[PDB]
């Protein structure tokens, strides 16, 4: 009897790896990371081959969904506070913050 939110998490993650949702996400992420002011992290992502970059960005998005939803059931109300708690800690991790923002957008659609 999985928690409702845990099931929805695993469903979303499945679509990232196997579905068109994922294909759009890694193309949105590549364009945001392309556009941003260069960091060693951003340069490294951009130098990767497509297949490697797609997989890294899926795996990073998974980590952030699992981090953002990792709750009890009451945090799934006012999900915007999770964004407020987390985002400020990523000011010096610009790649991670970009991926965190997209993970939050994906996560919000289901939990709201």
């Amino acid at each position: 009897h999985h928690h409702h939110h845990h099931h929805m998490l695993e469903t979303l993650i499945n679509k990232i790896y196997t579905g068109p949702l994922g294909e759009e996400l890694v193309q949105t992420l590549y364009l945001r990371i392309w556009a941003m002011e260069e960091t060693p992290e951003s340069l490294k992502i951009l130098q990767m081959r497509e297949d490697i970059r797609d997989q890294v960005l899926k795996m990073k998005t998974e980590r952030w969904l699992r981090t953002l939803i990792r709750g009890e059931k009451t945090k799934l109300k006012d999900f915007q506070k999770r964004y407020e708690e987390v985002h400020p800690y990523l000011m010096k991790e610009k790649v991670e913050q970009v991926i965190m923002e997209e993970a939050w957008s994906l996560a919000a659609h289901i939990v709201q």
Partner: protein, 357 residues
């Protein structure tokens, strides 16, 4: 030029030093040290205004950074001098960006003893030079696309900031250029061009047709909204209305063209033809009406080849019914752009000349 940029506003030379020096000399009447430091800063600031706004500017990063630095520096001294209590005798004289028409009215040039006015016109010039550097970029080069995307989003957010702040600390009515409706429309135009750059980056990289369609479809919305706004009250140069109309139709055509390729790959042969027919009628309008302002020949041919080949295959092999447009899944929207917020400092290695005061 298919890309819209904005001409910089012109201003008279101002002795910015004299009234700041006088205030320092009255605050530190015995302070040889403080008088020497801050009066020097005042003369440096007056030279900085002359370098930022007192001359025509090359479309280079170094000229934009000079401009951005001037904006930061005048934001930084606002609290440190009684601008608020109207006790600094400083008049700034600025000329409307949009130098058109008869001359009539009396507000080609406007003079106001207002640091808020100076702030709005300087930020306008930052936005304008950003729009010009972006429009100079070689969009067939990956670094040109990157610079264009950054500078359009900057210009968009700088024009928006002016729209949200210009009326406050301005007293009387602004010139038309910096009016909230004018800069609001300019903001949207820059956002639309920013989204167009992401569509061209995606095109250049031969990314999947699904995302390209969605990038183009988001650009259509932006250009459509800019065009609607610029119809109502048109204050802008005469080329803006037809370029926005053209880009609105061109971007809807691009969305339908790339969606058509996905319909083909998914063996929805009827939808392919439905979407290619829409693309073609949109590009017929553009060719027909906006002949002077955009060249859509290569695009128009591509569509017509794809449509001819689609109809032959469908008539002989597939016999798929051609859907009515109304029964098509709406194309999605991928937003890759935001109006970049203005948070001083916006210049690179910013040192407040009046840091110590």
């Amino acid at each position: 030029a298919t890309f819209i940029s904005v001409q910089l506003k012109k201003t008279s030379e101002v002795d910015l030093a004299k009234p700041l020096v006088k205030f320092i000399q009255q605050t530190y009447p015995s302070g040889g040290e403080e008088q020497a430091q801050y009066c020097r800063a005042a003369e440096e600031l007056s030279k900085l205004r002359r370098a930022a706004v007192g001359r025509p500017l090359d479309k280079h990063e170094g000229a934009l950074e000079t401009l951005l630095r001037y904006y930061d520096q005048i934001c930084s001294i606002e609290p440190k001098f009684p601008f608020s209590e109207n006790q600094i005798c400083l008049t700034f004289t600025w000329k409307d960006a949009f130098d058109k028409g008869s001359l009539f009215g009396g507000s080609v040039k406007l003079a106001l003893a207002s640091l808020g006015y100076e702030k709005s016109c300087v930020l306008f010039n930052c936005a304008a030079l950003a729009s010009q550097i972006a429009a100079e970029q070689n969009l067939d080069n990956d670094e040109g696309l990157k610079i264009a995307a950054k500078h359009y989003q900057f210009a968009s957010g700088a024009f928006l900031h002016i729209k949200e702040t210009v009326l406050s600390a301005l007293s009387r009515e602004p010139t038309v250029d910096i009016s909230p409706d004018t800069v609001g429309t300019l903001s949207l135009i820059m956002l639309a061009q920013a989204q167009e750059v992401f569509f061209l980056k995606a095109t250049r990289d031969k990314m999947k047709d699904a995302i390209i369609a969605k990038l183009a479809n988001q650009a259509a919305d932006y250009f459509g909204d800019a065009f609607k706004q610029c119809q109502y009250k048109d204050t802008l140069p005469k080329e803006v209305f037809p370029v926005l109309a053209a880009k609105h139709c061109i971007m809807q055509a691009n969305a339908e063209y790339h969606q058509s390729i996905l319909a083909k790959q998914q063996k929805k042969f009827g939808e392919e033809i439905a979407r290619l027919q829409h693309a073609a009628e949109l590009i017929k309008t553009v060719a027909s009406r906006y002949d002077e302002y955009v060249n859509v020949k290569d695009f128009s041919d591509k569509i017509n080849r794809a449509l001819a080949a689609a109809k032959k295959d469908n008539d002989f092999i597939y016999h798929d019914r051609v859907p009515d447009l109304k029964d098509l899944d709406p194309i999605g929207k991928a937003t890759l752009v935001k109006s970049t917020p203005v948070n001083v400092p916006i210049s690179q290695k910013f040192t407040d000349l009046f840091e110590k005061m």
